Amino acid sequence: SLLHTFWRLPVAVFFEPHEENVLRCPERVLRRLLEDAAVTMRGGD
């Protein structure tokens, strides 16, 4: 599940989200999104 990184030390994010892409990720919104996707999929011989 975890992620293996080449750099052992991370970087602090800087500057706007329109010059480098970044996966920001509060855990609550990801859980809500997964539940919403789950309900959406089944909701739509």
Binding site: S1, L2, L3, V11, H18, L23, R31, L33, L34
Partner: protein
């Protein structure tokens, strides 16, 4: 003094008019029969046995399946490579990421996304939109030339000192097509033309709109994207820029089956275009109803 064909054609007129539908039952159009056509003088025969209809319907089944079989082939390749490499996939598209995150939910979202993409398999897709230029006559010579020029040993010094310049093969910007799936609201974007560049800092890919603006997908957890290259390399990427890659495999079809279906058109000259090869062109003629008709 002679009777004229058009005069008896007009005075005889028509008496037949009926609508017919395409086999898919998607379009209707009218067929008209003139009682002065030589069809009536011919007196030829007609036969509509059941075996012929069954054979025609089988041919139609192949004609329909020509696209969905490529969809299925790419799907099966995705799954086979996903088992092949143990499911653990490297980063291939550049974006910043966190080690402290619930990656399992993104894995399940990836499962949802690939299922939803499989449902919305369609004739318009990045695989078909990348296949279509491959079929054009130029692609054989162009790919032959690209492979030949790539297969060049480093120049001997006199070649670089004298004569016409040395050159670099590929342009800095690549031309790509992609399929975008969003799970939070079931929705799939298939007819996408997109630009891609391989970053100089790290060997990873940066993807751009056809305006120069960056794309937003890698940041959004609820989206997965599929990518195909003009040489038919292939990627399936889930949030974080981690992708599964393989060939686009099409050996599951005979040449005529896909070729007759997806043959890109080439023009034959008609009024309002230059006789010089590929010259610039005026605005289209467009015989139109908003203006008083000319002769």
């Amino acid at each position: 003094d002679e009777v004229a064909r058009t005069d008896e054609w007009k005075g005889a007129g028509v008496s037949r008019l009926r609508e017919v539908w395409d086999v898919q039952h998607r379009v209707r159009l009218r067929v008209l029969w003139y009682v002065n056509s030589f069809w009536r003088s011919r007196e030829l025969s007609y036969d509509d046995h059941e075996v012929e209809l069954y054979r025609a319907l089988d041919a139609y089944r192949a004609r329909i399946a020509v696209e969905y079989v490529l969809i299925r082939a790419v799907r099966d390749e995705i799954y086979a490579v996903l088992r092949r490499d143990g499911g653990a996939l490297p980063q291939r598209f550049a974006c910043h990421v966190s080690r402290n995150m619930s990656w399992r939910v993104v894995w399940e979202l990836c499962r949802h996304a690939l299922a939803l993409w499989m449902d919305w398999a369609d004739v318009r897709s990045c695989i078909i939109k990348a296949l279509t230029p491959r079929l054009s006559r130029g692609a054989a010579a162009a790919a032959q030339r690209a492979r030949r020029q790539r297969e060049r040993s480093a120049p001997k010094p006199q070649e670089l000192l004298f004569g016409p310049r040395n050159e670099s093969g590929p342009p800095a910007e690549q031309t790509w097509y992609a399929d975008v799936v969003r799970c939070v609201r079931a929705q799939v974007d298939l007819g996408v033309e997109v630009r891609a560049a391989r970053c100089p800092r790290t060997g990873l890919w940066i993807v751009r709109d056809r305006r120069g603006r960056l794309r937003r997908w890698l940041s959004q957890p609820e989206v997965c994207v599929l990518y195909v290259t003009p040489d038919l390399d292939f990627y399936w990427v889930l949030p974080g820029g981690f992708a599964v890659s393989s060939r686009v495999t099409l050996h599951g079809l005979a040449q005529r089956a896909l070729r007759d279906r997806f043959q890109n058109f080439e023009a034959v000259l008609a009024r309002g275009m230059h006789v010089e090869a590929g010259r610039q062109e005026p605005e289209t003629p467009r015989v139109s109803g908003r203006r008083l008709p000319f002769d």
